[PDB]
Design a protein around this ligand. Structure first.
Ligand SMILES: *[C@@H]1O[C@H](CO)[C@@H](O[C@@H]2O[C@H](CO)[C@@H](O[C@@H]3O[C@H](CO)[C@@H](O)[C@H](O)[C@@H]3O)[C@H](O)[C@H]2NC(C)=O)[C@H](O)[C@H]1NC(C)=O
Ligand SMILES: *[C@@H]1O[C@H](CO)[C@@H](O)[C@H](O)[C@H]1O
Length: 1005
């Protein structure tokens, strides 16, 4: 009721006066108020729908006036001249309008004047008068800010010649026409400033509370960074099924990210996405930028520093139905139920934001974001903004040549191309060996789909061909491959149809067996490829589709290739620091940080020798299919030999065309004619090479006709005449040729006898031939490996009556029935000591795994002084009766069993075994029949007469020790085998289904 009429606004409160009874009708009016505030942005007052309205606000520290009397708006802007309006002092505004002529005045001095357009002269408002705030702004015309006020307002008046509306007073005192949303004190209270926060690490985020606006709403905030990439705000909907070419999880979402400098609003309301670049200029200069995003249904505006951009979502979709958390500064990892959509490139590239943020408003209301950061207890956030003293890279904090780069308050290091990893490149990175028959496949947990990727890795090979990395999909031909092709690195992106694959090449002579570093960056249609620190190669894919489906990431071999009928060759070499969208897969695999890893490659560097093969005679050779000619040639192989003369390779063509590799007086000769005549390049070594060590040999002829012979570490290069390289004709001979052929080989070839020794790692212009299997013909004997012939079975190969079996790589010993473990059944096998008092081990088959067999077999080792004891006992289920039992009775071993007819017993009467020394017993059953053997006595075998049941139904438990049967065993037992189960071992490995009970201890040796 009192002298002067003041009110305090805090961003959630506003007045709202109903003009509908008494419309404003003004051909001349006057507006007056004093404000007090610290905020760059806030709505003081507004009135009007339609094209008739007055809107007065503080907009980036200045006073912003828009009037429109119906035929065009007037727009004024008063700036402070020596100070700031948001200095938390009072400031007087006065608007005076006389027909079309507007005049505004801050503090009596600061003033401008102007006119509204065409010839309309009256303001007409039958709706609401809003003071201090609004329900929103995207529905309130000519409104530059969306933010509610945060300060004090007094003596707010609107008058004209007729009515006088003292809106400030009416508020305090109350009026049927007046309404106040929220709780407001009617003096001037101080409005707390909203402290800024910094996002120090990418991964630091915050959960903001749910954005409620379905149709219409806003967000405003300020940011500051030199970081070119970072996801700022993101929220999404709830899975609505069916992207009708790949089968993804579709969802409603919106996002604000930074990519490569520029800032983007993304939005998708049901009918597809729209990516809108929110300002043409890069905005990572480290200056505070204000963003105001408001929307009214399917359209809306985004603004950066008073510069607006209209946007429309495609479709007929008016509602953006967000549901759960609203994210700020980055996203949470391994959070169940979160979908990273493909269009938000940052999300899936793991580019969290780093940099300052402040003054967050949602739907007009201000939000204390420092406050949330203390309640959530979020790591990686600090409560300030400090554009720091000195770039951090000065300290040179990045070890082993890692490229430093200055970010917002942190050094950032790129340690690809250094063999290390980790923030500052201190953790040395795992290496992987492949011998052409090895792979390493990362089957991801869930089907990815990406529009952008970073993919980097290091390689090293003597081969000029082979797959480095490739993404594969169980459902299509889609891939992103790097491979070596003719000494070059070849990126290939291919996306299934429904005009073909897009390729990009980089670098040369890279099969030098020094490391190289490949770097791929894709961003939709844009491809970019850099080898080592050469010049980046770019390419722009044609074709409108850009989305890549992939279930797994492969190296070494491309295993997943249903739809391809042909594939790059397997890899021979070493990889390091494979990194895919932030993920260091090799390193994560070795350390066991991920389940979904599958490989038969090996960790750590090793001089590779790929599929060695022995040519036992000189006259031993094999014929392969013709060398594929044609443009350029890259031959590689290695060899071991005691002999100083022999022909290793031969293939001829039309006329005098041929190519040959031979060993002559221990030195390696390359010899050929490609239409100019016969030529000879000698391989460079000092010593003869028949030194029984392994040597590397690489012959090549590029399309510039430059021939290279390498031997171990030393190149020799030479030029040759420019003759169109031509098809070869004959079979390709390796290790020799036919006997009569030596009499008429090209003069200038020396050899009169074939190669004898080993050959390994044969690469024939991209082809890794199995020399034995892929052979078209063989002569003499060619055998696998380079270690002499493999061991074969003899009488005394295995021990303790173990069965010697022949395998491809030598013999083995089946120890099952022998009681002993180890390669030769000479090692002891797992033993349990049964001590005084009695005890018992018990296996219980899970209820639905109970085996019913037709033929059984069981073997055990033991020692005891007892005359009466039960040892092993297999019982069937309750109410079934079928069983099997091994026992000592009157000092002699015995076995008793039953499958559903009468009981059946075999005994060994001869061998006394209650003698304290080690014995072994073997039993077998087929139906009624059985056999029983002890140590090396002759087998006892029984056959009961007449009809006999034959299945041992529903085996339920296995009991060792006899205790239950009231005849406990004292002594030792080892090496129990029953129907494939090495039970005592399973006991010793704490098997889930074994309960040990009583005085039984394991003997650990
Ligand atoms: C338990 O052992 C008895 C006797 O060892 C098994 O019966 C016998 O099985 C053999 C081979 O299956 C029979 O040999 C015969 O040889 C001729 C000539 O090639 C062939 O044409 C016949 O058809 C037959 O296979 C033999 O007749 C048979 N003797 C009998 C039934 O008295 C019995 O199968 C074994 N039980 C189990 C469950 O393994
Ligand atoms: C280089 O600069 C950074 C400060 O961000 C510091 O962490 C290091 O100690 C210095 O090597």
């Amino acid at each position: 009721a009192a002298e002067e009429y003041i009110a305090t606004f805090k961003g959630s409160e506003y007045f709202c006066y109903d003009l509908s009874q008494n419309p404003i009708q003004s051909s001349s009016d006057e507006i007056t108020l004093s404000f007090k505030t610290l905020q760059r942005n806030g709505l003081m007052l507004h009135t009007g729908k339609s094209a008739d309205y007055v809107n007065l606000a503080l907009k980036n520290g200045a006073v912003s006036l828009v009037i429109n009397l119906g035929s065009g708006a007037f727009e004024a802007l008063v700036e402070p001249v020596n100070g700031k309006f948001n200095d938390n002092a009072w400031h007087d505004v006065k608007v005076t309008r006389n027909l079309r002529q507007v005049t505004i005045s801050v503090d009596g001095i600061l003033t401008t004047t102007g006119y509204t357009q065409e010839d309309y002269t009256m303001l007409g408002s039958d709706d609401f008068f809003y003071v201090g705030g609004s329900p929103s702004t995207a529905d309130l015309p000519g409104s530059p800010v969306s933010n509610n006020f945060m300060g004090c307002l007094k003596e707010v008046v609107y008058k004209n010649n007729d009515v006088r509306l003292e809106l400030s007073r009416l508020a305090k005192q109350g009026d049927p026409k007046m309404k106040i949303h929220g709780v407001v004190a009617f003096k001037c209270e101080n409005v707390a400033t909203l402290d800024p926060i910094t996002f120090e690490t990418p991964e630091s985020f915050i959960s903001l509370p749910k954005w409620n606006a379905k149709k219409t709403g806003s967000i405003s905030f300020d940011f500051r960074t030199t970081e070119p990439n970072g996801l700022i705000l993101f929220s999404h909907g709830k899975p609505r099924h069916q992207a009708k070419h790949p089968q993804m999880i579709k969802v409603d979402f919106f996002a604000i990210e930074m990519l490569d400098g520029h800032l983007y609003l993304l939005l998708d309301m049901g009918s597809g996405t729209i990516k809108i670049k929110a300002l043409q200029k890069k905005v990572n200069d480290g200056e505070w930028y204000h963003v105001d995003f408001q929307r009214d249904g399917r359209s809306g505006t985004i603004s950066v520093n008073t510069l607006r951009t209209p946007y429309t979502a495609p479709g007929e979709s008016e509602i953006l139905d967000l549901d759960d958390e609203l994210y700020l500064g980055g996203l949470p990892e391994n959070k169940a139920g979160l979908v990273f959509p493909t269009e938000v490139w940052t999300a899936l590239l793991n580019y969290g934001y780093v940099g300052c943020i402040r003054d967050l408003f949602i739907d007009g209301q201000s939000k204390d974001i420092r406050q949330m950061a203390e309640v959530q207890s979020t790591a990686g956030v600090k409560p300030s903004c400090s554009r720091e003293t000195a770039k951090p890279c000065l300290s040179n904090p990045c070890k082993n040549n890692g490229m430093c780069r200055d970010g917002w308050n942190r050094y950032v290091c790129d340690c690809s191309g250094t063999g290390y990893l980790g923030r500052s490149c201190e953790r040395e990175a795992t290496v992987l060996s492949y011998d052409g028959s090895m792979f390493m496949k990362i089957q991801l947990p869930v089907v990815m789909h990406t529009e952008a990727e970073d993919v980097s890795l290091r390689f090293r090979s003597q081969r000029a061909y082979g797959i480095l990395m490739a993404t594969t999909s169980r459902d299509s031909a889609d891939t992103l491959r790097l491979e070596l092709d003719a000494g070059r690195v070849k990126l290939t992106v291919n996306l299934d149809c429904i005009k073909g694959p897009e390729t990009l090449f980089a670098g040369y002579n890279l099969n030098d067996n020094e490391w190289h570093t490949v770097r791929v960056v894709r961003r939709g249609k844009s491809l970019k490829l850099t080898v080592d620190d050469q010049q980046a190669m770019t390419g722009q894919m044609a074709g409108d589709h850009t989305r890549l489906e992939f279930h797994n990431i492969e190296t070494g071999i491309i295993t997943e290739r249903r739809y391809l009928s042909s594939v790059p060759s397997n890899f021979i070499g070493h990889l390091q620091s494979l990194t895919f969208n932030g993920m260091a897969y090799i390193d994560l695999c070795k350390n066991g940080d991920i389940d979904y890893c599958e490989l038969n490659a090996r960790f750590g560097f090793r001089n590779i020798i790929a599929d060695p093969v022995t040519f036992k005679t000189k006259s031993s050779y094999v014929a392969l299919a013709t060398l594929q000619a044609y443009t350029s040639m890259h031959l590689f192989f290695q060899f071991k030999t005691t002999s100083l003369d022999g022909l290793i390779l031969y293939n001829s063509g039309d006329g005098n065309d041929f190519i040959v590799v031979e060993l002559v007086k221990g030195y390696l000769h390359y010899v050929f004619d490609l239409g100019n005549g016969a030529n000879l390049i000698k391989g460079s070594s000092n010593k003869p090479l028949n030194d029984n060590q392994w040597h590397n040999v690489m012959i090549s002829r590029d399309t510039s006709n430059l021939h290279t012979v390498k031997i171990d570490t030393k190149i020799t290069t030479q030029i040759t005449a420019g003759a169109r390289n031509l098809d070869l004709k004959s079979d390709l001979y390796i290790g020799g040729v036919a006997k009569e052929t030596y009499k008429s080989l090209p003069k200038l070839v020396h050899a009169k006898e074939g190669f004898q020794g080993c050959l390994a790692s044969v690469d024939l212009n991209g082809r890794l031939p199995d020399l034995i299997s892929d052979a078209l013909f063989c002569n003499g004997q060619i055998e696998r490996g380079c270690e002499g012939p493999s061991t074969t079975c003899q009488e005394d190969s295995c021990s303790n009556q173990g069965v010697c079996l022949q395998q491809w790589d030598g013999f083995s010993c089946d120890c099952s029935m022998t009681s002993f473990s180890g390669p030769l059944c000479n090692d002891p096998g797992t033993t349990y000591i049964f001590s005084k008092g009695g005890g018992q081990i018990t296996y219980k088959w899970p209820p639905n795994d109970r085996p019913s067999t037709r033929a059984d077999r069981l073997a055990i080792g033991f020692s005891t002084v007892q005359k009466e004891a039960v040892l092993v006992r297999v019982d069937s289920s309750s109410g079934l009766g079928d069983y099997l039992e091994l026992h000592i009775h009157q000092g002699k071993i015995g076995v008793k069993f039953n499958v559903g007819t009468d009981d059946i017993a075999i005994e060994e009467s001869n061998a006394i075994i209650n003698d304290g020394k080690y014995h072994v017993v073997r039993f077998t059953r087929s139906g009624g029949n059985a056999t029983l053997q002890v140590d090396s006595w002759p087998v006892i075998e029984r056959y009961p007469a007449g009809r006999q049941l034959t299945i041992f139904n529903s085996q339920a438990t296995i009991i060792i020790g006899g205790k239950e049967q009231g005849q406990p065993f004292q002594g030792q037992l080892s090496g129990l085998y029953y129907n494939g189960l090495k039970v005592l071992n399973m006991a010793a490995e704490n098997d889930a289904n074994i309960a040990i009970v009583g005085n039984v201890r394991l003997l650990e040796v």
